[PDB]
Amino acid sequence: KEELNIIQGALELRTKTVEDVMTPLRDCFMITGEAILDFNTMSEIMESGYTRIPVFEGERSNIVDLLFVKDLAFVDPDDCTPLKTITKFYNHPLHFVFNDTKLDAMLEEFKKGKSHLAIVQRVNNEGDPFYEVLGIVTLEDVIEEIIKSEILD
Amino acid sequence: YDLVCIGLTGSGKTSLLSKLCSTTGFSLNVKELGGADNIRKYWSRYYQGSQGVIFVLDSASSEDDLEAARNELHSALQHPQLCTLPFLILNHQDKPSVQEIKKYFELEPLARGKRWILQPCSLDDMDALKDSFSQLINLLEE
């Protein structure tokens, strides 16, 4: 009956990890540090719909800053302001979470409301082991998973 | 207890930490991160699973280095993984101005109402460091 759907959803959530629901790096919309916030780039940014865009330097796995769409409401597209100005001025925090982190803990990290996007990194391994960037995860993703489980209502 | 230490002079700070045990990466489980300019941007890759921070700043350093220390402390203060945690702010054994640090770091207005402690410490003063760490552990117990 209904309790069956409840238990199934709870099991699906408990088993699910952030790695399962994250968007892998190949699908993530990003932007390089060398970019300039001219008229064309703002069209490309405003069309993707993402509110927060990771900003990398050199490689897509080397994330150095975050870009907020609300920060692009006051900019004029003719001055051709470089991205470095906005990034260095705002300097938003960068959230890093491991791939093995579970839905509940990662969800607890968002509860403060100080952040909405984290970067999923893996403990990779010869050669000296390192952190490997897999993708990005958002509060929206975990909430979409929870409502997709149809537990509530 | 997992703690993180970030500060200028990353090898200098790891030497100050080695003085307690009788760098440029992952090192009471205190992980000391490097203080080089390039590694400061990648600092945030290690903050997960921390219960407190030990921020070290060279008060005797040049004005620009002090500016970098103030900016780094401000970035650490508002990080979601570190904002809810208590962390202690500590420099050299002998120095040629805690009030100046409070006024210029703007830690009175912003750093208000949370379990944060700015305490003096010197490499030649072991007992003062012990008392500062005792206060930090007392905050960690909350």
Residue numbers in the entry:
A (entry chain A): 429 to 553, 556 to 583
B (entry chain B): 33 to 54, 63 to 67, 78 to 140, 142 to 147, 151 to 196
Passage from the reporting paper:
Cystathionine-β-synthase (CBS)-pair domain divalent metal cation transport mediators (CNNMs) are an evolutionarily conserved family of magnesium transporters. They promote efflux of Mg2+ ions on their own and influx of divalent cations when expressed with the transient receptor potential ion channel subfamily M member 7 (TRPM7). ARL15 is a member of the RAS superfamily of small GTPases and associated with several metabolic traits including disorders of lipid metabolism. Structurally, CNNMs consist of an N-terminal extracellular domain, a transmembrane domain, and two cytosolic domains: a CBS-pair domain (also termed a Bateman domain) and a cyclic nucleotide-binding homology (CNBH) domain.
We present the crystal structure of the complex of ARL15 with the CNNM2 CBS-pair domain. As is typical, the CBS-pair domains are present as dimers with a small twist, possibly due to the absence of Mg2+-ATP. This twist generates two contact surfaces between the ARL15 and CNNM2 CBS-pair domains. The larger surface contains numerous polar contacts and involves two ARL15 structural elements: a C-terminal part of helix α2 with following loop and the loop following helix α3. ARL15 Gln98 makes intermolecular hydrogen bonds with CNNM2 Thr529 and the backbone amide of Phe526. Significantly, all the ARL15-CNNM2 interfaces show hydrophobic stacking between aliphatic part of Arg95 and the side chain of Phe524. Another key hydrophobic binding determinant is provided by ARL15 Pro130 that inserts into a small pocket formed by side chains of CNNM2 Pro521 and His523. Although a GTP analog was present in the solution, the binding site was unoccupied, suggesting that nucleotide binding was incompatible with protein-protein contacts in the crystal. These results establish that the first interaction surface is critical for the ARL15-CNNM binding while the second surface is dispensable and likely the result of crystal packing.
